[PDB]
Write a protein that binds this ligand. Structure first.
Ligand SMILES: [Co+2]
Ligand code: NI
Ligand code: NI
Lengths: 275, 10, 100
């Protein structure tokens, strides 16, 4: 369908000695494909999907250089922000950033993003126009004026519309056997008595990709939300995802209840009932 | 492919 | 940000059958700040060869990690995930239930 590339960076300061812990992860859609961890011995960007391994030495050097530079920038920023906010040297603090691009099924640019946070709260973000900045507070406002003077948004726009989209298209082609394959959910229903007169019906979706899914209960053909429980979508650990939704019902009335499953991999939604 | 853009905030 | 305690799900990779090889997962999510300690337990004892994912985060900036190991469910063995975080006054232990 449409596709995304996203990078997620986290720095966590280490009061008392040395540099922050820096972690970077890259995704295409919901597939991790690279990582960098400052705690790891390689000090290199490392592959996490088979289809990235073919990239040559220059790719790995360049990508390593980029994230190392960002880790240093984060270190500096952690210090200057601590100063701005008059915070002690004692506490650990964090900077996070997410950036990336979305492309349509024709491979054309749809949208770009570049947003960051300090201590888990919005700091500065590029707006959807890729021209303007959203600054959450007066430190970020200071940053905004600095980056306006330095043409930073222009650089980011050119990255997001250019490099980002070009490389995303490349990955989608190189990794097409998995990246452009949808794995529809494998579904089933379980039944768990909660007394001698009521039971939980749990509707399972397993082994699906991508992670986006909708699970709903209906009773007598209309959605029911009362007396239901919907768990957060969770990773299986093999690249696929899991979710379930449950409902408590009077025993003997199970045939009234139907579970409905919507996913990109299902041309029509699926309906399950208890046998 | 990562961004090469790494300007400081303050 | 306001400290926020992890959500915890403890589950198998594949539907469980006693005696059959599988993977035990503990997914911790929605937490802030990011420092967290997670162990998988067998009958109350720490399992030694446990791996984890690379730290990432959700739209709201809260963190998530998956911890995992191979295991073989049985009728007799109790599995659990034990989590410590600044929000918890003692480690929280969530028992694995194959139905969840
Ligand atoms: Co906080
Ligand atoms: Ni597509
Ligand atoms: Ni001004």
């Amino acid at each position: 369908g449409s596709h995304s590339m996203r990078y997620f960076y986290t720095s966590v300061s280490r009061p008392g000695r040395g540099e922050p812990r820096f972690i970077a992860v890259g995704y295409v859609d919901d597939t991790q494909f690279v990582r960098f961890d400052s705690d790891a011995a390689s000090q290199r960007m490392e592959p996490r999907a088979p289809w990235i391994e073919q990239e040559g030495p220059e790719y790995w050097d360049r990508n390593t250089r980029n994230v190392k530079a960002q880790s240093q920038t984060d270190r500096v920023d952690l210090g200057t922000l601590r100063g701005y906010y008059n915070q002690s040297e004692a506490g650990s603090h964090t900077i996070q950033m997410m950036y990336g691009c979305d492309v349509g099924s024709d491979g054309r640019f749809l949208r770009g993003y570049r947003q960051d946070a300090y201590d888990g709260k919005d700091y500065i973000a590029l707006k959807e126009d890729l021209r303007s900045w959203t600054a959450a507070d007066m430190a970020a406002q200071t940053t905004k004026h600095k980056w306006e003077a330095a043409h930073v948004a222009e650089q980011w726009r050119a990255y997001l519309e250019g490099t980002c989209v070009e490389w995303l298209r490349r990955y989608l082609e190189n990794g097409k056997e998995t990246l452009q394959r949808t794995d529809a959910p494998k579904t089933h229903m379980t039944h768990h008595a909660v007394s001698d007169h009521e039971a939980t019906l749990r509707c399972w979706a397993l082994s699906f990709y991508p992670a986006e899914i909708t699970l709903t209960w209906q009773r007598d053909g209309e959605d029911q939300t009362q007396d239901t429980e919907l768990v957060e979508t969770r990773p299986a650990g093999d690249g696929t995802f899991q979710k379930w939704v449950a409902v408590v019902v009077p025993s003997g009335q199970e045939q009234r209840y139907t579970c409905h499953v919507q996913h990109e991999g299902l041309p029509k939604p699926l309906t399950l009932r208890w046998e | 492919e990562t961004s090469p853009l790494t300007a400081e905030k303050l | 940000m306001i400290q926020r305690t992890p959500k915890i799900q403890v589950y198998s990779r594949h539907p469980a059958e006693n005696g059959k090889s599988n993977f035990l997962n503990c997914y911790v999510s929605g937490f802030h700040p990011s420092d967290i300690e997670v162990d998988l337990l067998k009958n109350g004892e720490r399992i030694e060869k446990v791996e984890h994912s690379d730290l990432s985060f959700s739209k709201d900036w809260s963190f998530y990690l998956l911890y995992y190991t191979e295991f073989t469910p049985t009728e007799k063995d109790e599995y659990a995930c034990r989590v410590n975080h600044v929000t918890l006054s003692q480690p929280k232990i969530v028992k694995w239930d194959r139905d969840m």
